[PDB]
Amino acid sequence: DLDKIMTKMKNKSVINIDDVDDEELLAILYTSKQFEKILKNNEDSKYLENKVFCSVFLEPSTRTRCSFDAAILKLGSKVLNITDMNSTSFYKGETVEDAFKILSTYVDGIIYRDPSKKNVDIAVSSSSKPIINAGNGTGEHPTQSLLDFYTIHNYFPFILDRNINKKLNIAFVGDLKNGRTVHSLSKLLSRYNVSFNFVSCKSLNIPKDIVNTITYNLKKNNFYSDDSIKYFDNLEEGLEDVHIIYMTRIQKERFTDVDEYNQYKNAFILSNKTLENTRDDTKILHPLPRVNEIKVEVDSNPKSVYFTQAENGLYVRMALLYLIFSST
Amino acid sequence: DLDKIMTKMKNKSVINIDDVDDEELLAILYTSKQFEKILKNNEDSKYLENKVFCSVFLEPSTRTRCSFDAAILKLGSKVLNITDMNSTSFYKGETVEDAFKILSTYVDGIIYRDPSKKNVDIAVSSSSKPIINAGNGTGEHPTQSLLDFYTIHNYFPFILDRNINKKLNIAFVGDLKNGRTVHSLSKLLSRYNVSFNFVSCKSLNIPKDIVNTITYNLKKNNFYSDDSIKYFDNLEEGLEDVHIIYMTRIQKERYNQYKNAFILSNKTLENTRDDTKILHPLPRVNEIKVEVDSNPKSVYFTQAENGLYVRMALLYLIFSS
Amino acid sequence: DLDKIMTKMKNKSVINIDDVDDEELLAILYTSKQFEKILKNNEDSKYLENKVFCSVFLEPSTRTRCSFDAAILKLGSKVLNITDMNSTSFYKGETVEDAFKILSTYVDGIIYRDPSKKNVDIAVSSSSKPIINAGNGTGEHPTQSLLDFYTIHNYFPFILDRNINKKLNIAFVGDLKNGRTVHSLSKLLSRYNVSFNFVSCKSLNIPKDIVNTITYNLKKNNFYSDDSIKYFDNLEEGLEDVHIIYMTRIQYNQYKNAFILSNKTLENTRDDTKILHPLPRVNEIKVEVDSNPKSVYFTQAENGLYVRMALLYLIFS
Numbered sequence: 024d025l026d027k028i029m030t031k032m033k034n035k036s037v038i039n040i041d042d043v044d045d046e047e048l049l050a051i052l053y054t055s056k057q058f059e060k061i062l063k064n065n066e067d068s069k070y071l072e073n074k075v076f077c078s079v080f081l082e083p084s085t086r087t088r089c090s091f092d093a094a095i096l097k098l099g100s101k102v103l104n105i106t107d108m109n110s111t112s113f114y115k116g117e118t119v120e121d122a123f124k125i126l127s128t129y130v131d132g133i134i135y136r137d138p139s140k141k142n143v144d145i146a147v148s149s150s151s152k153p154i155i156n157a158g159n160g161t162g163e164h165p166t167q168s169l170l171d172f173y174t175i176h177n178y179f180p181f182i183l184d185r186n187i188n189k190k191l192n193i194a195f196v197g198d199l200k201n202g203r204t205v206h207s208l209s210k211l212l213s214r215y216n217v218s219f220n221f222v223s224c225k226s227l228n229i230p231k232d233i234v235n236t237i238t239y240n241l242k243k244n245n246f247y248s249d250d251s252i253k254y255f256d257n258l259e260e261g262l263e264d265v266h267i268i269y270m271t272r273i274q275k276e277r278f279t280d281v282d283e284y285n286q287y288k289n290a291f292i293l294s295n296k297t298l299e300n301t302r303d304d305t306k307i308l309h310p311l312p313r314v315n316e317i318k319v320e321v322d323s324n325p326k327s328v329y330f331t332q333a334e335n336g337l338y339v340r341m342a343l344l345y346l347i348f349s350s351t
Numbered sequence: 352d353l354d355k356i357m358t359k360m361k362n363k364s365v366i367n368i369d370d371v372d373d374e375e376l377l378a379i380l381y382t383s384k385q386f387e388k389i390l391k392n393n394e395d396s397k398y399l400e401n402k403v404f405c406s407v408f409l410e411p412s413t414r415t416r417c418s419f420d421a422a423i424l425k426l427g428s429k430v431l432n433i434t435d436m437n438s439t440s441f442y443k444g445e446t447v448e449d450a451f452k453i454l455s456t457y458v459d460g461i462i463y464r465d466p467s468k469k470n471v472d473i474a475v476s477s478s479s480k481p482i483i484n485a486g487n488g489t490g491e492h493p494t495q496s497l498l499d500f501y502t503i504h505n506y507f508p509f510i511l512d513r514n515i516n517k518k519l520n521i522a523f524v525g526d527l528k529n530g531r532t533v534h535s536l537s538k539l540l541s542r543y544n545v546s547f548n549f550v551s552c553k554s555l556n557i558p559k560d561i562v563n564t565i566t567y568n569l570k571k572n573n574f575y576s577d578d579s580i581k582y583f584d585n586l587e588e589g590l591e592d593v594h595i596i597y598m599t600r601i602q603k604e605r606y607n608q609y610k611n612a613f614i615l616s617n618k619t620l621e622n623t624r625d626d627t628k629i630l631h632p633l634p635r636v637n638e639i640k641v642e643v644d645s646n647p648k649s650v651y652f653t654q655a656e657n658g659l660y661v662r663m664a665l666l667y668l669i670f671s672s
Numbered sequence: 673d674l675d676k677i678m679t680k681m682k683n684k685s686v687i688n689i690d691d692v693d694d695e696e697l698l699a700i701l702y703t704s705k706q707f708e709k710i711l712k713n714n715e716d717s718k719y720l721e722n723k724v725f726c727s728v729f730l731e732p733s734t735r736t737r738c739s740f741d742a743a744i745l746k747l748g749s750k751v752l753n754i755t756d757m758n759s760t761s762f763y764k765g766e767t768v769e770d771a772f773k774i775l776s777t778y779v780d781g782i783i784y785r786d787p788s789k790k791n792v793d794i795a796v797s798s799s800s801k802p803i804i805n806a807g808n809g810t811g812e813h814p815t816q817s818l819l820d821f822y823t824i825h826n827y828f829p830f831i832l833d834r835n836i837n838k839k840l841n842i843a844f845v846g847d848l849k850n851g852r853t854v855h856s857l858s859k860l861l862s863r864y865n866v867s868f869n870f871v872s873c874k875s876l877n878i879p880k881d882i883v884n885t886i887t888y889n890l891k892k893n894n895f896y897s898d899d900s901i902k903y904f905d906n907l908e909e910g911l912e913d914v915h916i917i918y919m920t921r922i923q924y925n926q927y928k929n930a931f932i933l934s935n936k937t938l939e940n941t942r943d944d945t946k947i948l949h950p951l952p953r954v955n956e957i958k959v960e961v962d963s964n965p966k967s968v969y970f971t972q973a974e975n976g977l978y979v980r981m982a983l984l985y986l987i988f989s
C-alpha cells in the first residue's frame with residue numbers, strides 16, 4: 024500500500040537505518056525498482072520538480088555529494104551547495120542550531136554530511152525541514168545501507184521473506200572495526216534471516232557493539248543460532264558458502280601510520296583465484312572506491328556487481344527523496 | 352499601480368539603496384508580502400522560470416550567496432556560481448570591464464559581491480545586463496536594507512507615512528564604522544520620520560558622511576531636529592525609547608575589547624519599550640545571548656526568513672517578462 | 673542533412689578538433705547560427721531539457737567552466753560541478769577508469785578539463801557517456817577552435833567553399849610556440865583555402881610540426897603554394913593583406929610587449945579585416961581598438977555561447 028506508506032514517510036528525516044521500518048523499506052525497494060525501469064528505458068524521471076534542496080557537505084566527500092546532486096537534479100529539482108573542508112570553516116562562530124533554523128527557512132530539505140555525531144543531531148532538532156544524513160562520524164550512512172540492500176535483494180529476493188528455511192550468508196571482508204558501511208548494513212540485514220562471516224586482521228575485528236546488535240536483531244525473529252556469526256582471518260575459509268561477498272574500503276585517512284595502512288591494504292585481495300571455490304551464485308559488492316582490495320581482473324568475472332551497485336545508488340536515492348518530499 | 356511600477360523597474364540595476372525610489376520601495380514591499388503568503392502556504396512559487404543568472408562572490412560570503420541562490424532557484428530560474436577568496440584571484444590580469452562585458456553576454460543578470468567599492472560600479476557600467484549588488488566596499492548592501500525595512504515595517508507600519516507625530520526611533524549597536532548593513536539601512540530610514548541612536552565604542556563610531564546623508568535626508572522632509580541623532584556609550588542609555596534595536600555583527604577580521612562591549616541580554620532589555628523589536632543581520636556569535644531568542648521582542652530569525660521573500664520579489668520585479 | 677548528421681553526431685565524444693569532420697562542422701555552424709537567432713530574438717531556447725551533466729574541472733579555468741555551464745543551463749538542462757586545483761586531490765587512490773565508469777552511470781554527459789592527456793584519454797575509454805574536452809595541456813581545445821571558426825565564417829563565409837579563387841588570409845600574432853589556441857585553429861583552417869602569416873619573436877615561433885600539418889592539409893586539398901605560409905618579425909609587414917588578425921594571449925616581460933595592437937598599427941590593414949583574440953587580454957590589444965569596427969573579440973566570446981549550445985544539442989538530444 025504505497026499510498027499509506029508514502030503519507031507515513033512524507034517529511035521524514037533519515038539519519039540512522041533504524042529510522043526506516045519494514046514497510047518503509049519495502050516502499051523504498053519498490054520505488055527504487057520503478058526508477059531503475061524508468062531510467063533504463065530513457066523515460067521522463069522528473070517526479071519531483073518544484074523542490075529546492077541544500078546539500079551541506081562539511082568534509083571532503085565529493086563522490087557522495089555528486090551522487091545526491093545527480094539524484095536531485097534527475098528528479099527535476101534544484102540544489103544549492105555548501106561545501107567545506109571541515110565544519111568549523113563553515114560555522115565559524117555560529118551555532119549549528121542557528122545555521123539550520125535559518126537554512127531550513129530557505130529550502131525544502133537538506134542533505135547533510137558531517138563527521139561530527141553531535142552536529143547532525145543538533146541539525147535535526149533545529150531544522151524545520153527534513154534532513155538526510157549522507158554519513159556521519161558515528162557509523163551511520165543510511166542511504167548506502169539502503170542501496171546495498173537493494174542490490175542484495177535483486178539477486179536474492181528471499182532475503183525479504185523471513186523464511187526460516189531460506190537463509191542468506193554474507194561475508195564482510197576488511198576493516199570491520201571502522202567500516203561504517205559494514206556496521207549499518209549488518210544492522211539492516213540482521214532484521215532478516217541472515218548469517219554473517221566476518222573476515223579481518225585481528226586489530227580490525229568487528230566491534231562487540233555491532234555483534235550485540237546483530238544478535239538482538241536475529242533473536243527477535245528466532246533466526247539466531249551459534250552458527251549465525253563466524254569469524255575468520257583468511258579468505259579461503261571466510262568465502263566458503265556465502266551468497267554475498269562485501270569488501271570494505273581500506274581508508275588511508277584512517278591509518279596515520281603508513282606501514283599500518285600498507286599492511287591492511289594488502290591483507291585481503293580479491294582475485295579470480297580466491298573466487299574459484301565460492302558458490303556459483305555469489306555476488307561481490309564493494310561500496311567504492313577501491314584501491315587494491317579487488318583486482319581489475321575481477322571486473323570481468325560475472326560474480327562482480329560493485330559497478331551495478333554504485334549505479335543502483337542513483338535509483339535508491341531518487342526513490343528516497345521522492346518518497347519523503349513529494350506533495351503527492 | 353504595480354503594472355506601471357514593474358515597467359519602470361524592468362532591467363534596473365540595484366547597486367545603492369538610492370537606486371530605489373518611494374514607489375519602487377512600495378512595490379518591493381507589496382510583492383515581498385505576496386511571496387510571503389505563497390511560501391507560507393507551501394505553494395508554487397515559480398514566478399520567474401526561464402532566466403539564467405550568474406552569482407559572482409569575490410570574498411567569502413557563503414551565507415549571502417546561499418540566500419540569493421535559494422531565491423533564484425525557488426523562483427524557478429537557474430544560476431551558475433563564481434566564488435573566490437578575493438577579486439584578484441579571479442580577475443588576474445583582466446579588467447573588470449572586459450570580464451563583465453563578456454559575462455553579461457552569457458546570462459540574464461548578475462549578482463555581485465566584492466569588497467572593492469569601485470569594482471561594482473565598473474561592473475555596472477560595463478555590463479549589458481542588470482546587476483544586483485550583494486554587498487561592497489562602500490558600505491552599500493541594498494537587499495539587506497530592503498529586507499530590514501520590510502521587517503521593521505511589519506511591526507511599525509507607520510514608518511511609511513511620514514506623519515510628523517509618528518516617529519520611529521532606532522538604535523544601531525556595535526560596529527558602526529565598518530557596518531555595511533548600518534550604512535545602507537540608515538540611508539533608507541532617513542527618508543522617513545526616524546530618529547537614530549548610535550551605540551558604539553570610540554574606535555567604531557558611525558562615519559560623518561553617514562551622519563551627513565541622514566541629516567540631509569531628514570531635512571529634506573522636515574524631520575530633522577537636534578534630537579534626531581544621538582550618540583551613546585552604554586546600552587542602558589542607548590536603548591531607552593527605541594522601537595527597533597539593530598545589533599551589528601562584530602567580526603574578527605576588522606577585537607577582544609570590541610567583542611564584549613555590547614552584549615544583548617534579557618537584563619539589558621528590561622527598560623526598553625514593551626513593543627521594541629530586536630534585529631540582527633546574522634550570523635550571530637556572542638552579540639546576543641541565547642536567552643533573548645525566547646524573548647518575544649526578538650525577531651532576527653523572522654528577519655532572515657523575510658530575506659527569502661524580499662530577494663524573490665526584487666528578482667521578480669526586475670527580471671520578469 | 674541535419675537529422676542524419678545529428679544521428680551520426682549523437683553520442684560522440686569531442687576531444688580533438690580532428691574528431692569533427694566536414695559535415696559535422698557544417699551542422700555545428702548551422703545549429704550555432706540558429707541558437708544565435710533564437711537568443712537574439714528573446715525566444716525560448718530550452719532544446720535540451722531532461723538532461724543532467726557533470727562538469728569536471730581539475731584545474732582552475734573559471735571562465736571556460738562558466739561558459740559551458742551557461743550553455744547547459746540556457747538549453748534547460750542541469751549541471752553538477754566538480755571543481756578542484758588538481759586531479760590528484762580528486763582521484764586520490766581511485767583510477768581514472770573506475771571514476772568515469774561510475775560517474776557516467778549518474779549523468780548523461782560530462783564536460784572535462786584536465787591538464788593531463790593520459791587522464792582524458794582514459795576517461796573517454798571508460799565513460800559510457802559522451803565527453804567534451806574543455807581544454808587540456810596539449811592544446812587540444814576543440815570548442816575554442818569551433819567558436820573561432822564560427823566567428824571567422826560569419827564575416828567571410830567563403831571559407832567553407834573550398835573555392836580556389838576565394839582565399840582567406842590570416843595573421844596569428846604573439847606567442848605561437850605555446851599558444852595552443854593557434855595550433856588547433858591552424859589545423860582546422862588548413863582544411864580550407866587559407867594562407868597564414870605567423871608574426872612572432874624568434875623564441876616564440878610557430879612549431880615546425882604545426883607548419884608540417886598545415887602544409888600537409890593544404891596539399892591534400894590542393895591549396896598549397898609557396899605563398900601559403902609567411903613568417904614575420906613585425907606587424908607592419910605581418911598585418912598586411914589579411915582578412916583576420918588573431919592575437920594570442922601572452923600568459924616574459926620583454927616578450928609580452930613586442931606586438932601590441934593599436935589604431936596606428938591597424939591603419940594599413942584591409943578595410944574588411946576582423947580582429948580576434950581568445951581572451952582574456954592583458955596588454956596585447958589597446959583599449960582604443962575596442963571602438964574600432966575591425967575589432968570583434970567580444971562578439972567572438974559571445975559566439976561561444978551559441979557554439980557550445982549547438983554542440984551540446986547535437987551530441988545529447
Ligand SMILES: Oc1cc2ccccc2cc1O
Nearest residue numbers: 086089311312333771774775
Ligand atoms: O563511488 C563513486 C562515486 C562517484 C560519483 C561521481 C564521480 C566519481 C565517483 C567515483 C566513485 O568511486
Ligand SMILES: Oc1cc2ccccc2cc1O
Nearest residue numbers: 122125126414417633634655
Ligand atoms: O546565519 C545564517 C546561516 C545560513 C546558513 C546557510 C544558508 C544561509 C544562512 C544565512 C544566515 O543568516
Ligand SMILES: Oc1cc2ccccc2cc1O
Nearest residue numbers: 450453454735738951952973
Ligand atoms: O575574458 C573572459 C571573462 C569571463 C568572465 C566570466 C565568464 C566568462 C568569461 C570569459 C572570458 O573569456
Ligand code: NA
Nearest residue numbers: 102103430751
Ligand atoms: Na548549481
